[PDB]
Design a binder for this molecule. Structure first.
Ligand SMILES: Cc1ccncc1NC(=O)[C@@H](C)c1cc(Cl)cc(O[C@@H]2CC(=O)N2)c1
Ligand SMILES: Cc1ccncc1NC(=O)[C@@H](C)c1cc(Cl)cc(O[C@@H]2CC(=O)N2)c1
Lengths: 304, 304
């Protein structure tokens, strides 16, 4: 028993972290096979991050201007190209520590682990979610760019996120491993609108099932609701509308606990309308939405 | 910016996880050099966990009864001994992946990362604290015994915890890497009293400094207090008494923010007496006490 915001073991990803230096800028790169992936804003001086012409800026750059260091050893760059907002540096040596990997573009509401890095060195691992407004509420400082978000399925690492920037609001924006930003964000130092961030309803419900599974049952009531009645409440509280797909995904948790999804929705509705009244659920005083139904099942069954 | 419950990268510890089987029991072991460390309750059948005589139970066990597997390869056990509540299995092969390591016994209030494991395989990493009552609020299931708690300083892993049991209350108990339990707990299936769990005052204060450092300043007031006035409030709310050592440890955070420790204590006092009033601090609706002043400085400065 017990329920914690658990990240994936970071070992397979630590062996991929390298340092990329271009002129005066140092950030992180991901070394997989003979390619180093990093944010293209590595080629930007501070004077041009305001409105950069990346194509023009990259032309003034040659293979020898990209310094790639894996630990204490220098990697030889034999190729360089720009794919959307990431640079791909072809190196002459394949990473001996390359794990089995996939590049995947996650959906909002999905979760992933981040290995925060500085100068190609890992500093920490935390679990987060792609928010419905495509931002991530992470912990990143200057030098953390190029830090990656991933998931693990047995032995295969699915890379889903690369850190590119912090908005003036303190939230984080970045791309998939093909360089496409999640959301409407651009790698430009300009006023960018994050957008309204709703609560991931299906995740809050999955966490309510985890709470029941771990003994916290105070919030369970004698009521039920309908998808349309629950969704009227969800709209008022800026919660994502719950669909039949969400009910279906919650199926195994509903089966394991013997609590129908719509009954849990009525508990959620009562918590939304009345609040916690000074009580906690899994040691939290707010409704947690960064655990997917898959995360709950995984953590409550012990998948390694 | 941003503040998250961040665990250490788990790679160096993943390379040490092995599976130990004794009769019908399978749990995790820690392989460092030519020794595998694991909970001695590996030798216990279910019928004898109620009141085991470990010395007598171990006598009926030989080196060949301890099955140690590192991934898919079997390790040859050439020695076995009991040190307090851990068994030390001497194997004929040193772990090629042994990192630089220390065995340390942490203080209550200190934090550490846990690599939850099942069958010698890592499943997740989370950050937790040794509670003032010597328990840990972790996430552990059957098979997780032998999972370790550690800290990292540059390249040296300081092992501080080994998971042994869950109390009927849902909290977790375990030992240091010499087999001595943290707290009054025994590796026996009996009714054990966890004890009153107070809040780690110095950690809540460190987290209030992290909140200010990251923009959350609503809780700052026009008041101050004294150590004795603050401690009268701390006692009422089951908070650890704040000492001059705690004030001294908070020094660098006080210097960085320009907010005197006693002024922050008055903010804490007002939050304790009045509550959050529906507001949040670093995305939390309660006062967080599982970040030490060292964790706050580390995460706010980017130490790798
Ligand atoms: C300094 C910092 C702290 C933590 N993590 C990453 C960072 N990154 C940043 O804030 C920096 C270097 C940056 C890069 C890019 Cl590609 C775009 C930028 O514009 C921001 C987005 C917005 O709105 N204004 C800013
Ligand atoms: C089943 C489980 C779940 C998660 N993590 C570890 C576990 N462990 C346990 O609860 C088991 C196997 C256990 C071992 C030991 Cl050494 C002592 C025990 O007594 C408990 C302590 C108390 O009070 N009663 C119990």
């Amino acid at each position: 028993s017990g329920f914690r915001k658990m990240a994936f073991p970071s070992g397979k990803v630590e062996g991929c972290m390298v340092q990329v230096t271009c002129g005066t800028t140092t950030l992180n790169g991901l070394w997989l096979d003979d390619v180093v992936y990093c944010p293209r804003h590595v080629i930007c001086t501070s004077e041009d991050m305001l409105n950069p012409n990346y194509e023009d800026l990259l032309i003034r750059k040659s293979n020898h201007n990209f310094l790639v260091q894996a630990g204490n050893v220098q990697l030889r760059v034999i190729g360089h190209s720009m794919q959307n907002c990431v640079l791909k540096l072809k190196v002459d040596t394949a990473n001996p520590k390359t794990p089995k990997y996939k590049f995947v573009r996650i959906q909002p509401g999905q979760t992933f682990s981040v290995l925060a890095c500085y100068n190609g060195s890992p500093s920490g691992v935390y679990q987060c979610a792609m928010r419905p407004n495509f931002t991530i509420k992470g912990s990143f400082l200057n030098g953390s760019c190029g830090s990656v978000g991933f998931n693990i399925d047995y032995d295969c690492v699915s890379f889903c996120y690369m850190h590119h920037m912090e908005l003036p609001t303190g939230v984080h924006a970045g791309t998939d491993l093909e360089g496409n930003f999640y959301g409407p964000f651009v790698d430009r130092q300009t006023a960018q609108a994050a957008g309204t961030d709703t609560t991931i309803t299906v995740n809050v419900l999955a966490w309510l099932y985890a709470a029941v599974i771990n003994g916290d049952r105070w919030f369970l009531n004698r009521f039920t609701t309908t998808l349309n009645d629950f969704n009227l409440v969800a709209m008022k509280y800026n919660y994502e509308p719950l669909t039949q797909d969400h009910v279906d995904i919650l199926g195994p948790l509903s089966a394991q606990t013997g609590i129908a999804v719509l009954d849990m929705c009525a508990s959620l509705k009562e918590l939304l309308q009345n609040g916690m009244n000074g009580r906690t659920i899994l040691g939290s005083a707010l409704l947690e939405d960064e655990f997917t139904p898959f995360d709950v099942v995984r953590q409550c069954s012990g998948v390694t």
